[PDB]
Amino acid sequence: MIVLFVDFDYFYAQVEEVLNPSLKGKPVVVCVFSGRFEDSGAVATANYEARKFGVKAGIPIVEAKKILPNAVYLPMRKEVYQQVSSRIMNLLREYSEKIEIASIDEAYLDISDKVRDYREAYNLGLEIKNKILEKEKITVTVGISKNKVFAKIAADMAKPNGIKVIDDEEVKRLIRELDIADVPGIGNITAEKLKKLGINKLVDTLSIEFDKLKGMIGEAKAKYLISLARDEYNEPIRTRVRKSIGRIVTMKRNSRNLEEIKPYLFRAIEESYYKLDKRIPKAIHVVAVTEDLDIVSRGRTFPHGISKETAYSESVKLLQKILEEDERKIRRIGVRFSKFI
DNA sequence: GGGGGAAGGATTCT
DNA sequence: CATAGAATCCTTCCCCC
Numbered sequence: 001m002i003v004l005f006v007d008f009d010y011f012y013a014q015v016e017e018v019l020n021p022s023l024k025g026k027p028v029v030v031c032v033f034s035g036r037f038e039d040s041g042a043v044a045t046a047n048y049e050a051r052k053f054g055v056k057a058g059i060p061i062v063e064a065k066k067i068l069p070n071a072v073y074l075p076m077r078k079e080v081y082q083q084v085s086s087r088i089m090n091l092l093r094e095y096s097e098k099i100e101i102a103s104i105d106e107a108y109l110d111i112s113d114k115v116r117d118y119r120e121a122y123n124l125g126l127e128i129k130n131k132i133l134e135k136e137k138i139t140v141t142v143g144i145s146k147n148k149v150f151a152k153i154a155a156d157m158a159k160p161n162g163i164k165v166i167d168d169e170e171v172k173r174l175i176r177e178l179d180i181a182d183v184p185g186i187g188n189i190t191a192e193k194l195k196k197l198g199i200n201k202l203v204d205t206l207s208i209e210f211d212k213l214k215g216m217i218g219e220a221k222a223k224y225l226i227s228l229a230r231d232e233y234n235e236p237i238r239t240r241v242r243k244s245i246g247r248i249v250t251m252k253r254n255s256r257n258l259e260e261i262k263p264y265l266f267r268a269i270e271e272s273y274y275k276l277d278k279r280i281p282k283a284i285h286v287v288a289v290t291e292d293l294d295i296v297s298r299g300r301t302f303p304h305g306i307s308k309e310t311a312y313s314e315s316v317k318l319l320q321k322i323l324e325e326d327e328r329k330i331r332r333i334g335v336r337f338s339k340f341i
Numbered sequence: 342g343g344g345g346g347a348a349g350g351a352t353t354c355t
Numbered sequence: 356c357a358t359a360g361a362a363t364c365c366t367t368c369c370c371c372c
């Protein structure tokens with residue numbers, strides 16, 4: 001194929017820069033405040049200014065304020081960003097039928113039936129980067145290659161405000177040279193396992209007895225890596241269908257007291273049903289994060305859709321099944337719905 | 342042996 | 356100190372044939 005991947009640059013923070021251009025050049029930090037104490041919570045993302053000082057997606061806000069006490073700290077306005085993304089996504093649908101929207105700020109475009117080589121594909125990418133920059137004033141990064149994974153690797157390398165092709169011949173090179181922990185899907189727990197077997201490059205998975213590989217990292221990840229190593233990974237650009245909807249909130253204080261937890265759980269069901277927007281679910285899961293930050297959950301599938309009134313009743317049973325079977329106190333509580341009609 | 346699908350946890354991603 | 360939405364995977368279990 002020919003895949004052109006787009007990922008928006010420091011997206012939530014960049015949208016706050018468009019809406020308030022006096023922030024450009026200072027470090028901007030977009031925060032998810034949790035309500036326990038002043039500045040409790042996590043950073044959703046930060047602009048590249050702030051990243052230079054190690055403030056980035058995932059770290060505590062209190063930690064970010066020690067490093068960069070004079071950054072701008074905004075609360076996340078997810079709905080604002082979703083609407084700007086939808087507009088950018090609508091802009092991208094004008095460059096192929098086949099488009100896979102992979103998150104709030106990425107899309108894969110199968111542009112095979114639309115250009116014939118990589119310099120065509122490179123030019124279309126420059127076109128895409130300029131429209132997005134005219135219509136919405138957002139800079140993005142483009143990766144182009146022969147499949148989705150190496151398109152995404154290409155943008156990862158070219159960040160930020162970049163465009164990069166990985167032709168067939170560097171896909172061969174990267175199969176030998178690229179640190180395997182830079183392959184999408186290889187997080188920290190898989191990486192150290194791969195390295196405990198002396199696997200550092202994609203090509204290294206061809207010279208291992210397969211079941212040692214399957215034994216350590218699981219059957220699906222082994223075939224995934226071997227597929228890329230063999231330059232035969234191909235996966236279609238597909239339309240993504242939302243398979244679950246849910247909400248999880250953080251409680252002012254920890255607790256395993258049912259009457260104390262219920263209002264948070266119930267807010268989370270209420271919001272999930274708004275979000276459900278006429279989709280009807282057969283499955284419900286209750287998710288708790290314990291005081292030691294373990295995640296535990298209890299669900300149930302029904303033979304029929306769940307009314308709101310049933311979700312309320314059943315999620316209290318599933319939360320009690322949690323409080324029965326585990327002794328830790330609860331820090332975060334949420335509900336998730338799946339198996340729509 | 343295996344179709345199925347659950348359930349609970351792990352891992353990764355944004 | 357440790358947000359939040361969501362997918363896919365693994366293991367075990369179960370319930371038939």
Ligand SMILES: Nc1ncnc2c1ncn2[C@H]1C[C@H](O)[C@@H](COP(=O)(O)NP(=O)(O)OP(=O)(O)O)O1
Nearest residue numbers: 007008009010011012043044045057058104105355
């Ligand atoms: N850990 C997190 N927690 C909450 N929100 C997050 C998050 N990680 C990402 N997001 C939200 C906010 C992120 O902005 C948005 C896009 O995530 P990316 O494309 O992975 N990172 P960005 O676009 O920010 O910078 P780059 O230029 O490096 O892509 O998703």
Ligand SMILES: [Mg+2]
Nearest residue numbers: 007008009010
């Ligand atoms: Mg991005």
Ligand SMILES: [Mg+2]
Nearest residue numbers: 007103105106
């Ligand atoms: Mg992204």
